Design a protein around this ligand. Structure first.
Ligand code: CLA
Ligand code: CLA
Ligand code: CLA
Ligand code: CLA
Ligand code: CLA
Ligand code: CLA
Ligand code: CLA
Ligand code: CLA
Ligand code: LMG
Ligand code: BCR
Ligand code: SF4
Ligand code: SF4
Lengths: 218, 663, 128, 79, 119, 86
């Protein structure tokens, strides 16, 4: 798809592409706004239509060009044109510098028609109820945005919910020994792979002690 | 890109929602911010106390009111307003003397009962409370520094093992610990504070109320009853003994949980785990909800028992103090009651983890399993009460308009009368077994009539409907049949669109917004009941079974002095009351447009106004609107602003009426 | 053994050997409060009641010095006024130290000193 | 004073006013000194609450932090 | 006289109900145009980014935002999951645990917290 | 900007795409329904939030969900006309 050369509306006064329209106060507010949206189309007959900004208009038998402040007005006019069997209309966003961005028929095929090369953006692979609970994701990446969680996080919190209901079989986290641990950070033994072995043996000692203590009055 | 005019409202709508802060990353920051805010709030309370004490000391007449309290009137503070007449004399001043306001708070009786005799003592008290405000702010700074110092001590902290990250959860153990907090609150803050106040009474209050006596002997602890005849208040000896008993009981109770040692006391978690609870006690919203639900019975009983059993000297002799205190505390407890439900709903939205679908283990789970039954039965009882109270009131109104007072349906309040008879028999048996009998209990038991029965049914209706709205909002905050994803959204959000039938007022916050109207209406009913029975017990007892009596013999009749306040005949000392009456009517009606008219109309109106501004010669060359773009208030902001206007109008319209009617 | 024990988690803790604990020299039956080590008096190691187990020693040493300094002056003031040393100026004939406080606060010179002590202490509070 | 309300007129309720001053100017100034102290401390507290905790202090601030011996006990006593 | 406190009022009332409120409103509208304005509730402020990074620099709060933080030995967890999936893998299925988790972690939500691009 | 998410329950109606007034939604090929197509929201920065897509969605509960974010509003999500934020 080739973007056209839509000029800035303040530099294209009196263009032959402009349809005959009455002109109202509803048009884009100059002297305060510099971002304009332009919609172009090619018609077959001078059929009267309604401008999104109040007032009616008559197309041209050839090319047409209109400028609007908002993309919504351009899309409304596009739907109105498409109701009149007028395809091949393109909607551009004009930056303040004059950069032309091609917006509505982005890949050249209207969004209601399946086109190859598209990928489901903002897709979630479950029913809407499958979203994780907001309470589970507190102070994580998804603090108040449980609907933004990746499906792996949703499954992880679901498994956590499943686990944290069998209370008797849970493992209480041992209380840290603050007074005798906690040396200066430079005082470490390195041996990271040995540190997990130390984790294993210390947790084994904790579990054995807990079992021995429980097997006294239970 | 930048923001629009709605930024101010958006920010101020969650200005204290510390959970919604952007820099806050952990429960440590949240808890420390909350603790510091608590310290600042305590400082504000202390400064307010010192303020009242100062103004009583400086711009007031405590030294003269204490001498002749029954016919005298206290002074709140002077009036310095340049808008008054620089000539003549205002109706609030004795000619050339300064302008004063009569205090309707009740601090004069409080200080008189507590043992204050001189202005100098009040001045020293003001100084001490300002000192305490300084102390509170310095404690806030101290605790901020201590927690930051723990955080810095994590620069010299490592367990030499991968379990070192466990310390993340214990950094705010100072604030989040529950057993120590419960033990020390219930013991010290309740029991020993009561015991210290008993000491205060025995050392000052009882010595500075009667002739000199023995060295505060244990004869200062009496068991008389109520309403000492001369001062028409509770015996100070009885009050000291009551505080002593409560203090001893709460001190004993405060040794329950495992606070400082692991070898004494039971843990709250183990207490809950073996009961019908085991809730998520780490939620701050849950704790806030269930302590607001605790301050509510306390404040409601405060309102009831300040009036029924007046504890302060000559408090019953003030016709305005007794009504103002009751209405104030009733409104405070209504606000706290609706707060409890609002924060329960916020707890369910934000801080509640639920099982998959069927594990009926949590109490909230079991409540949610049959929530439809709860709401349906609450709706049934609300409908019954409304139908059968309005219909009987309508019967009485119609049959008394038709010259037939004897055709009314007057159900004699037999159950309340039986309770009163049992309590009266118990009290009379207590009194008859005394060598110092002939005691009085003031309004602990009051004449109960069919009007009382109908008003109690109306109050029950209001409470039922308020609880219905709040409970429905809480239970369906996480999802209803109409919107089965409501826990994915915020606690308060605009709507769910015009489709699917239309979804205005769908959030749990909208349920709170609807329930606040019913809270205000129920409180208005309670306050009208109390004030009407206070103004004329006889006329209330006879003609209060038909609503026209409430409309005529109370509202229309008792509003005579207030409207006459300022007129084209002169002004009274009720001029401020009448002016505030009209201003609060204007505020109440002004919030109707924020509630009835909704956003889109106004957004178009604002677009037109902005068109004008961007079209006016000089404005357009200075202000294009790109910086702080004016926009109409959002939907939730609009509902909240209308609710604020309505609440302010309804609440603040009443005190002028109370003052005009009683004074 | 300066550490309270030797372990990794406070469930399988190995308490230090009884004869190997540091122990306070003042109270021989108590372990040495390690928070006091470094400060001036931290060789008698006297802190029962455990008020330094809870409060930064910087505060207590600040309070200890202020109490001692204020008492060293107050003891000298009481001794000198009792032995008889009334200031050279008149209006200082309080006859007795026990009634000197109420006498002088009546005269008006105590309100001045309380202000001067107050400002220096507010400056002290900023320093502390 | 021009009273309003039925009860004040029909009972003769009056509002006495002290002919003295109440508090002298010196006492008001003494209260205002401590009020200013509260004000300065409250402005400082508002600043600290606005800025919040700074976790990165361990990279620049001196000292090494401190956990009081009771705070450690409260950490390992449970939660 | 009962007056003589109005000497304080004639200064304080005009001050605190006119000069202080006007200065406060002017200072508030000035503060509204700072880049730091309402940095705790308004998204995309510089100070919010600095505070988040400062929290992340703390050794305790490095992996605090990760919802999966906690696995003491993630290699053991992954090995056990792979072993359990091997015995339940349907027929000649070609999906492994590693790439399954990798593709279940990678979602496509470009418009999430995109306000972290201005400040 | 709001957050428009498409869930697996989509059946390729294309009604949500047609109802959108700012071309936020589009149809992408897929294999989870008989229509071999699901919706997508590649341009939610232009989502005003009218929720017409939710009105048009016929699944039992909407396969397309729009989450309003008021503290997030941009000039496109507010439909600003008199004023430019760029
Ligand atoms: C008593 C309640 C009340 C009040 C005061 C208003 C006021 C207003 N409405 Mg409104 N409205 C209400 C109820 C009310 N409404 C209700 C119940 C509904 C039903 C839905 C509506 C529906 C409605 C619609 C549909 C429209 C209005 C409009 C208006 C505005 C036109 C009138 C105007 O500009 O006068 C000025 C406003 C006043 C309040 C007059 C008094 C001003 C005071 C007395 C003087 C200034 C005070 C002074 C400066 C003190 C300073 C403040 C202090 C903090 C220092 C105005 C703001 C129209 C509008 O905005 O078009 C222009 C409009 O389109 N209203
Ligand atoms: C144009 C209207 C107007 C204005 C601007 C004022 C202004 C004022 N009145 Mg006022 N007053 C008015 C009409 C007005 N009055 C009328 C019609 C009456 C009835 C006759 C009164 C009766 C009245 C009384 C009885 C008192 C005042 C007081 C005050 C002052 C309190 C300021 C304050 O603390 O702010 C605080 C503002 C708020 C907390 C509101 C926040 C929102 C202030 C100078 C008080 C005073 O003298 O203070 C020293 C006081 O006691 N006024
Ligand atoms: C009225 C209800 C009630 C119940 C059912 C219990 C039950 C219990 N308490 Mg308890 N307690 C209560 C009130 C209650 N207490 C009150 C009011 C206090 C404050 C004085 C305490 C103070 C208390 C302490 C200090 C301790 C208990 C302990 C215990 C447990 C051992 C029972 C025992 O040896 O007592 C005979 C038991 C589960 C002990 C325990 O097991 O703790 C681990 C323990 O150390 N309780
Ligand atoms: C067949 C008729 C019928 C029956 C058996 C019930 C039965 C019930 N309703 Mg109910 N209801 C009905 C019609 C009916 N309703 C209608 C038409 C409405 C719309 C106004 C409601 C609105 C309604 C509400 C709002 C509530 C109930 C509730 C209840 C339950 C408690 C009893 C109660 O509150 O009654 C009181 C009933 C009313 C106040 C509604 C008015 C009664 C209507 C007018 C009777 C119509 C009967 C019909 C004309 C018969 C025609 C027969 C003919 C065709 C052969 C109970 C299960 C409550 C509940 O769920 O609690 C458990 C509750 O909160 N109903
Ligand atoms: C005069 C004003 C008025 C009246 C009469 C009602 C009447 C009612 N409201 Mg209502 N309400 C009002 C104003 C009013 N509201 C306002 C201003 C608000 C703020 C938005 C609400 C918000 C509100 C909520 C949120 C709820 C109610 C409910 C109810 C019902 C309570 C049950 C009952 O008593 O039914 C008896 C019926 C009558 C007395 C009507 C008369 C019937 C004929 C004439 C006899 C009832 C239909 C509750 C409800 O639905 O209960 C089931 C409920 O949930 N109302
Ligand atoms: C939803 C129903 C309901 C509710 C919430 C209340 C609520 C209240 N009633 Mg009440 N009352 C009701 C129905 C209800 N009433 C009925 C139907 C009658 C018979 C006419 C009464 C007669 C009555 C009297 C005489 C008194 C109260 C009083 C009170 C207050 C104190 C509580 C009490 O003792 O009530 C008692 C508890 C109940 C009545 C609950 C019964 C609920 C059932 C389901 C209602 C229907 C019963 C049914 C009609 C019986 C038919 C019998 C038939 C088969 C022969 C309280 C506000 C007292 C009061 O306010 O004094 C100041 C008081 O003295 N009530
Ligand atoms: C207000 C006075 C005061 C204060 C703040 C301190 C403060 C301190 N002293 Mg110190 N000391 C004092 C008076 C004081 N001292 C006196 C009078 C003596 C002489 C006996 C000593 C002898 C002494 C020794 C030998 C040592 C200390 C040490 C310390 C440090 C650690 C001890 C600690 O935590 O206690 C601080 C907290 C308090 C003192 C509060 C105590 C308040 C209690 C409740 C009062 C109880 C006494 C009461 C009046 C008696 C009751 C009367 C009747 C019932 C019998 C700390 C800086 C140790 C040190 O150098 O460590 C670095 C050390 O080895 N002190
Ligand atoms: C704890 C310290 C202390 C305190 C509170 C007092 C209190 C008192 N002394 Mg006194 N005195 C003290 C120590 C103290 N003395 C010592 C150590 C000596 C020996 C040199 C004396 C010798 C002494 C004499 C000879 C007399 C008194 C008298 C008096 C009384 C009246 C003093 C007066 O009017 O203010 C006078 C002082 C001022 C108005 C202000 C002085 C400036 C202050 C004190 C210094 C600055 C404040 C602050 C501490 C800054 C220093 C910081 C520092 C730590 C670096 C009063 C009860 C008189 C008395 O009782 O008889 C009538 C009297 O005649 N004193
Ligand atoms: C007499 C006075 C009594 C009357 C006061 C009663 C008011 C009831 C108190 C309820 C307050 C809690 C509700 C609240 O804050 O949220 C009510 C809403 C909450 O705000 C909503 O929050 C949601 C997230 O939870 C979403 O972000 C919504 O977009 C946002 O609007 O707040 C606002 O809308 C405030 C708008 C008006 C702000 C005025 C500033 C006030 C300045 C004067 C002081
Ligand atoms: C020097 C001097 C002087 C002067 C003085 C002055 C000048 C004073 C002033 C004073 C003042 C002028 C004061 C004021 C005050 C105020 C206050 C005191 C307030 C407070 C507040 C608070 C406390 C609260 C706070 C808060 C808030 C609200 C916000 C948030 C946070 C917080 C909570 C913090 C004289 C000569 C006299 C004497 C000598 C000395
Ligand atoms: S309307 Fe709903 S079901 Fe139909 S294509 Fe759109 S998202 Fe899918
Ligand atoms: S809310 Fe409106 S603009 Fe946004 S995707 Fe849905 S239909 Fe399109």
């Amino acid at each position: 798809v080739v973007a056209e050369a839509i000029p800035r509306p303040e530099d294209l006064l009196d263009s032959p592409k402009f349809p005959m329209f009455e002109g109202s106060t509803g048009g884009y507010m100059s002297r305060s706004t510099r971002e304009r949206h332009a919609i172009t189309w090619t018609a077959k007959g001078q059929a009267k239509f309604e401008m999104p900004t109040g007032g009616f208009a008559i197309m041209n038998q050839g090319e047409n060009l209109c400028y609007f402040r908002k993309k919504e007005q351009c899309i409304a006019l596009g739907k109105q044109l498409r109701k009149m069997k007028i395809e091949n209309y393109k909607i551009y966003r004009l930056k303040k510098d004059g950069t032309v961005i091609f917006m509505h028929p982005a890949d050249g095929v209207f969004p209601e028609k399946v086109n190859k090369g598209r990928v489901q953006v903002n897709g979630r692979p479950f029913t809407i109820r499958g979203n994780p609970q907001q309470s589970e994701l507190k102070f994580t990446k998804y603090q108040g945005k449980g609907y933004e969680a990746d499906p792996l996080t949703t499954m992880f919190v679901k498994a956590r919910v499943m686990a944290f209901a069998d209370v008797p079989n849970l493992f209480a986290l041992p209380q840290p020994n603050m007074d005798e641990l906690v040396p200066a950070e430079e005082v470490d033994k390195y041996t990271r792979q040995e540190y997990t072995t130390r984790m294993m043996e210390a947790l084994k000692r904790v579990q054995d002690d807990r079992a021995a203590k429980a097997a006294k009055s239970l | 890109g930048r923001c629009a005019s709605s930024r101010y409202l958006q920010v101020l709508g969650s200005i204290h929602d510390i959970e919604c802060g952007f820099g806050i990353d952990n429960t440590l920051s949240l808890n420390l911010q909350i603790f510091t805010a608590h310290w600042g709030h305590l400082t504000i309370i202390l400064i307010w106390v010192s303020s009242n004490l100062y103004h009583i000391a400086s711009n007031a007449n405590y030294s003269l009111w204490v001498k002749n309290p029954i016919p005298s009137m206290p002074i709140a503070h002077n009036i310095w307003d340049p808008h008054f007449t620089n000539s003549t004399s205002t109706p609030y001043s004795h000619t050339i003397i300064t302008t004063i306001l009569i205090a309707y708070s009740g601090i004069y009786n409080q200080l008189y009962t507590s043992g204050f005799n001189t202005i100098n003592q009040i001045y020293k008290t003001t100084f001490t409370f300002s000192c305490l405000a300084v102390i509170s702010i310095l404690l806030a700074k101290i605790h901020i520094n201590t927690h930051s110092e723990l955080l810095h001590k994590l620069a010299s902290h490592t367990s030499q093992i991968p379990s070192f990250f466990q310390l993340l959860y214990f950094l705010d153990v100072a604030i989040s610990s529950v057993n120590i907090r419960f033990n020390f609150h219930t013991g010290i803050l309740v029991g020993l504070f009561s015991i210290g106040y008993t000491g205060h009474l025995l050392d000052i209050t009882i010595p500075a109320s009667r002739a000199p006596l023995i060295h505060t002997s244990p004869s200062y602890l009496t068991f008389f009853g109520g309403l000492k005849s001369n001062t028409s208040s509770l015996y100070l000896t009885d009050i000291a003994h009551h505080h002593l008993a409560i203090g001893i009981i709460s001190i004993l109770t405060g040794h329950l949980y495992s606070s400082f040692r692991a070898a004494l006391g039971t843990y709250i978690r183990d207490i809950l785990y073996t009961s019908h609870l085991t809730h998520s006690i780490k939620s701050l919203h849950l704790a806030l909800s269930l302590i607001l639900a605790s301050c509510t019975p306390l404040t409601s009983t405060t309102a009831q028992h300040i009036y029924s059993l007046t504890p302060y000297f000559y408090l019953s002799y003030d016709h305005i103090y007794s009504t103002a205190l009751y209405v104030h505390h009733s409104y405070i407890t209504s606000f706290l009651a609706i707060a409890s439900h609002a924060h329960t709903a916020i707890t369910l939205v934000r801080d509640w983890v639920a099982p998959l679908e069927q594990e009926s283990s949590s109490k909230q789970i079991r409540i949610h399993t049959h929530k439809a039954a709860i709401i349906s039965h609450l709706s049934w009882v609300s409908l019954w009460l409304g139908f059968h109270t309005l219909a009987v009131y309508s019967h009485n109104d119609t049959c008394i308009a038709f010259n037939s007072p004897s055709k009314q349906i007057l159900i004699e309040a037999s159950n309340g009368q039986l309770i009163q008879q049992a309590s009266g028999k118990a009290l009379y048996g207590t009194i008859n077994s005394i060598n110092n009998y002939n005691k009085s209990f003031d309004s602990f038991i009051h004449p109960i009539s069919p009007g009382d029965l109908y008003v109690h049914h109306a109050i029950a209706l209001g409470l039922h409907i308020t609880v219905l709205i709040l409970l429905k909002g809480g239970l369906e905050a996480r999802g209803s049949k109409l919107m089965p994803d409501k826990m994915e959204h915020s606690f308060g959000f605009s709507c769910d669109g015009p489709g699917r039938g239309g979804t205005c007022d769908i959030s749990a916050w909208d349920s709170f917004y609807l329930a606040t109207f019913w809270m205000l209406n129920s409180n208005a009913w309670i306050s009208f009941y109390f004030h009407y029975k206070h103004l004329t017990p006889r006329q209330f007892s006879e003609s209060s079974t038909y609503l026209e009596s409430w409309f005529r013999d109370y509202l229309w009749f008792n509003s005579t002095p207030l409207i006459h306040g300022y007129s084209t005949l002169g002004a009274n000392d009720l001029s401020v009351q009448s002016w505030s009456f009209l201003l609060t009517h204007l505020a109440w009606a002004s919030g109707f447009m924020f509630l009835i008219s909704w956003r889109g109309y106004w957004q178009e109106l604002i677009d037109i106004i902005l068109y004008i501004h961007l079209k006016t010669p000089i404005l357009i060359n200075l202000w294009n609107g790109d910086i702080y773009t004016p926009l109409a208030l959002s939907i939730v902001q609009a509902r909240f602003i209308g609710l604020v206007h309505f609440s302010t109008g309804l609440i603040l319209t009443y005190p002028p009426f109370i003052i005009g009617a009683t004074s | 053994x300066x550490x309270x024990x030797x372990x990794x988690x406070x469930x399988x803790x190995x308490x230090x050997x009884x004869x190997x604990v540091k122990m306070s020299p003042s109270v021989p039956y108590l372990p040495y409060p390690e928070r006091l080590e470094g400060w001036v008096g931290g060789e008698k190691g006297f802190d029962p009641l455990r008020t330094s187990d809870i409060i930064d020693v910087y505060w207590l040493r600040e309070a200890e010095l202020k109490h001692g300094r204020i008492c060293m002056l107050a003891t000298l003031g009481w001794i000198s006024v009792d032995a008889g040393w009334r200031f050279e100026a008149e209006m200082f004939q309080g006859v007795s130290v026990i009634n000197a406080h109420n006498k002088m606060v009546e005269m008006g010179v105590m309100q001045q000193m309380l202000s001067i002590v107050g400002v220096c202490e507010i400056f002290s509070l900023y320093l502390i | 004073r021009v009273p309003g309300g039925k009860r004040t007129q029909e009972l003769g309720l009056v509002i006495p006013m002290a002919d003295e001053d109440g508090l002298t100017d010196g006492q008001v100034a003494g209260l205002f000194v401590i009020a200013l102290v509260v004000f300065i401390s409250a402005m400082d507290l508002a600043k600290t609450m606005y800025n919040g905790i700074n976790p990165a202090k361990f990279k620049t601030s001196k000292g090494k932090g401190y956990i009081s011996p009771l705070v450690k006990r409260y950490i390992e006593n449970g939660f | 006289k009962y007056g003589d406190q109005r000497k304080f009022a004639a200064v304080l009332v005009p001050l605190t109900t006119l000069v202080f409120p006007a200065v406060a409103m002017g200072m508030f509208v000035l503060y509204s145009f700072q880049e730091d304005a309402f940095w705790r509730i308004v998204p995309g402020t510089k100070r919010a980014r600095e505070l988040d990074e400062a929290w992340r620099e703390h050794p305790l709060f490095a992996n605090s935002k990760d919802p999966l933080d906690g696995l003491i030995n993630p290699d053991d967890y992954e090995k056990g999951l792979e072993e359990a999936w091997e015995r339940a893998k349907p027929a000649g299925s070609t999906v492994t645990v590693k790439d399954k988790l990798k593709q279940l972690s990678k979602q496509n939500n470009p418009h999430w917290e995109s306000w972290r691009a201005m400040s | 900007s709001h957050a428009v998410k498409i869930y697996d329950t989509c059946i390729g109606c294309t009604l949500c795409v047609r109802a959108c007034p700012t071309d936020v939604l589009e149809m992408v090929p897929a294999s989870i329904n008989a229509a071999k197509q699901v919706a997508s929201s590649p341009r939610v920065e232009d989502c005003v939030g009218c929720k017409r897509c939710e009105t048009a969605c016929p699944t039992d509960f909407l396969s397309i969900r729009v989450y309003l974010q008021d503290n997030e509003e941009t000039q496109y999500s507010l439909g600003l006309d008199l004023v430019d934020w760029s």
